[PDB]
Amino acid sequence: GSHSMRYFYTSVSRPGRGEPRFIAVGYVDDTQFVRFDSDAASQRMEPRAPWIEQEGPEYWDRNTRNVKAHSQTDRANLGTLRGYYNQSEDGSHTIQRMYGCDVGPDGRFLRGYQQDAYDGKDYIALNEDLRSWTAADMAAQITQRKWETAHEAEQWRAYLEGRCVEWLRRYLENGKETLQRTDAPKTHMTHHAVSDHEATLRCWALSFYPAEITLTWQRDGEDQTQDTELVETRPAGDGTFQKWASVVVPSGQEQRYTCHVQHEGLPKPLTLRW
């Protein structure tokens, strides 16, 4: 299938205590591979996936140098924004950023992106053509005019259509065995009594990768969406994911209900019945 590389930045000011805290992480698909924390003793970009340790010290020197610059620029950015909004200095504020690129299943460029948010709401985003921006409010249009006066986009465009895709293709080869795998879900059902008239039917998918998956119940064939709980997909802590879906059923009707499971690693979709 398609693949993606993505970096996530979070800077959070803390007035009255120290300087703002900066946290960057990088992902290929649903696998983390690098991190940086401006509060940690190390002060280095550190590895978080087996297949990235095979990069030499030039790799870690450039990435560290670059990530630290970005943190300083964001401590500046926090200050500028609290001017555009006329906010006090007692208040904690947040800047988040996501950027990266997608390749299609043949390896070719598909999409690059960069979006920024302030206090959890869109601030400014790069358009899909990689040559203009969209702003969310008045304050952000000051930034949109700045970046149009200089020629920022061309720089953004060079990274997204260039180094980003190129390093994503390299990562996809080195960690072939981690990143191009699919682990099909391990599935089963459980049964619990709510009382005497009803009982809970629970459908489990475990140890799957990548995280995308669909659990649907069908009593007699209609996509049952009443009395069905459906928990947010969650990480197991070892690289795989978990999910379940329940449905309350009346004692004696269990055999009506089937569970249906789709996942990329499944030769066909799965059906489970109590």
């Binding site: 670059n66 990530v67 950015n77 924004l81």
Partner: peptide, 9 residues
């Protein structure tokens, strides 16, 4: 590989 360009508002 993180970007080399900086983004300043």
């Amino acid at each position: 590989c993180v970007a080399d360009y900086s983004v300043l508002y």
